[PDB]
Design a protein around this ligand. Structure first.
Ligand SMILES: COc1cc(N2C[C@@H](C)n3c(c(CCCOc4cc(C)c(Cl)c(C)c4)c4ccc(Cl)c(-c5c(C)nn(C)c5C)c43)C2=O)c2c(cc(C(=O)O)n2C)c1OC
Ligand SMILES: OC[C@H]1O[C@H](O[C@H]2[C@H](O)[C@@H](O)[C@@H](O)O[C@@H]2CO)[C@H](O)[C@@H](O)[C@@H]1O
Length: 516
């Protein structure tokens, strides 16, 4: 659980040009004598947060920018401080994607969007609408072919259709109303229903994954796929005559892909930060570094202006950027992980018939909102307990649940602190909480005490009640500013460790019901 000094270990996804990246790594070694090892582990985006938390993991991690806010919030990423001469070399909007709480937390590499990829020998004129695909499949079935196959196991691929008629993740208005989540509105239902009808009508198969769709397209069995620039390499190898074009419309509106910026972050625990900065700035993020990677697997529209000027002339890149402009740049906020996990489950379940569309997307909504809803409740309870007066500000979206949960919490939590005063007092003294630093350390003890045994609402109340007990203390010793970080810490333990149980209860609505 310690990163070796004097070399660089890099993680990148197995669908990217890791062989090309290693070539850049060989050029680095040739100059510096430093060995660069490139790995592509399965589920690297899930592994990185676990291993980095213990001071382990790679020196550099590559992923789309959406995951990096969560990493940064957890303290896992070194701040990046390029000089102006280096910053000026990349498009300002790519830097924006890797900015979190005012600070740059990675190097942007390339802009990625999904496009429609089509076999020009089977389909000289690709469909402009989703709606015409059923009839097109019927035509192609008569030839022993099919219209469309794409990965149905990852929600990234289905999201453009879900968002077309009005589905959205976190509402953007001045900022991201994390409280306003749009995964179960009429637009999202209409899009996912269209997909589920395609499967029911035998135009697609719920089990199709990345590998199956890729093989089917690259063997000329299906006339269309939906994929990103990284996929073009393998299609070149297959010698399918393909084009890349704008995704189909749904209900007269453009498909709206979530746009990712492939980004390179530096592990906060790396003893090799200067090596990493040197590698990224002066080897990778150059014309020749990016070309080496791009020649292995296309990056998309790269962040480096000098090299993108060349790539932009490619009609596949123009198509990529057209789709991107119709879509939206992903948030990098910490709750994106939870959003993706919820929507993944919803798509799979609706596709398989395990849930209806309405059942599936309702669960997704609950799952995506759970962090913020929980924090509203816990923060307000903590602060009103500590100060003696309630917060007057409006709840917001799903404000009844919040209000009702806080009402219930007050009633059911009243007993608890009195009833367990002695044990709460004893635990308080052993913890010796004095400052914000102490608060940040509590996470481990807290997890431990809330571990094992059973899960029920009473125990959740006990968790939060001790929270309020600590908050009251923090206020009396003039550390009122520590209550909000205490609330965040309790929320994080709750929603992570109890996610599936919470969603099963219909979230905080279950709580209000249970103590009715
Ligand atoms: C093992 O299975 C259990 C355990 C519990 N309990 C009882 C005791 C151990 N307990 C519990 C909590 C809430 C979870 C942790 O809460 C926090 C802890 C820390 C360190 C922080 Cl900083 C914060 C903000 C919250 C307790 C919280 C405080 C104390 Cl002092 C105790 C406690 C008591 C009472 N006696 N002792 C010796 C201690 C250490 C806390 C906790 O989860 C269970 C259940 C089921 C329930 C229930 O139905 O209510 N409870 C409360 C359980 O499953 C069998
Ligand atoms: O499906 C959810 C998944 O979507 C995105 O991951 C993409 C990634 O951006 C692409 O570069 C490519 O590798 O395909 C992935 C989908 O399989 C998000 O970036 C990711 O965080 C999320 O889990």
């Amino acid at each position: 659980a310690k990163i070796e000094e004097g070399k660089l270990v890099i993680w990148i996804n197995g669908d990217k040009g890791y062989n090309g990246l290693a070539e850049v790594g060989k050029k680095f070694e040739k100059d510096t004598g430093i060995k660069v090892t490139v790995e592509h582990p399965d589920k690297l985006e899930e592994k990185f947060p676990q291993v980095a938390a213990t001071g382990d993991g790679p020196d550099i991690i590559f992923w789309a920018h959406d995951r990096f806010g969560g990493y940064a919030q957890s303290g896992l990423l070194a701040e990046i401080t390029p000089d102006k001469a280096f910053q000026d070399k990349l498009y300002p909007f790519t830097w924006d994607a890797v900015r979190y709480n005012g600070k740059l937390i990675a190097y942007p590499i390339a802009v990625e969007a999904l496009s429609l990829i089509y076999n020009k020998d089977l389909l000289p004129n690709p469909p402009k609408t989703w709606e015409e695909i059923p009839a097109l499949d019927k035509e192609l079935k008569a030839k022993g072919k099919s219209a469309l196959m794409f990965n149905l196991q990852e929600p990234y691929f289905t999201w453009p259709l879900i968002a077309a008629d009005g589905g959205y993740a976190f509402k953007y208005e001045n900022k991201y109303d994390i409280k306003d989540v749009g995964v179960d509105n009429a637009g999202a239902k209409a899009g996912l229903t269209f997909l589920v009808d395609l499967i029911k009508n035998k135009h697609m198969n719920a089990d199709t994954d990345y590998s199956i769709a890729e093989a089917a397209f690259n063997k000329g069995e299906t006339a269309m796929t939906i994929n990103g620039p990284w996929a073009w390499s393998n299609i070149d190898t297959s010698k399918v005559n393909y084009g890349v074009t704008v995704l189909p419309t749904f209900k007269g509106q453009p498909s709206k892909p979530f746009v990712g910026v492939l980004s390179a972050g530096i592990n906060a625990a790396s003893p090799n930060k200067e090596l990493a900065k040197e590698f990224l700035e002066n080897y990778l993020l150059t014309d020749e570094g990016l070309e080496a990677v791009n020649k292995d697997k296309p990056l998309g529209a790269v962040a480096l202006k000098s090299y993108e000027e060349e790539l932009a002339k490619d009609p596949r890149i123009a198509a990529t950027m057209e789709n991107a402009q119709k879509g939206e740049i992903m948030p990098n906020i910490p709750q994106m992980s939870a959003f993706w996990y919820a929507v993944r489950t919803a798509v799979i379940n609706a596709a398989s018939g395990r849930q209806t569309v309405d059942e599936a997307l309702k669960d997704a909504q609950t799952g995506s909102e759970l962090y913020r809803q929980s924090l509203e409740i816990i923060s307000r309870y903590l602060r009103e307990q500590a100060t003696g007066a309630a917060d007057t500000a409006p709840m917001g979206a799903s404000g009844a649940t919040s209000r009702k949960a806080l009402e219930t919490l007050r009633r059911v939590g009243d007993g608890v602190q009195r009833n367990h005063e002695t044990a709460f007092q004893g635990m308080l003294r052993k913890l010796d909480i004095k400052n914000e630093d102490d608060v940040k350390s509590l996470s481990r003890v807290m997890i431990h005490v809330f571990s094992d045994g059973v899960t029920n609402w009473g125990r959740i109340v006990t968790l939060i009640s001790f929270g309020a007990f600590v908050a009251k203390h923090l206020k009396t010793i003039n550390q009122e500013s520590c209550i909000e970080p205490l609330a965040e810490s309790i929320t994080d333990v709750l929603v992570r460790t109890k996610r599936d149980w919470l969603v099963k209860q219909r979230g905080w609505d279950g709580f209000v019901e249970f103590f009715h």
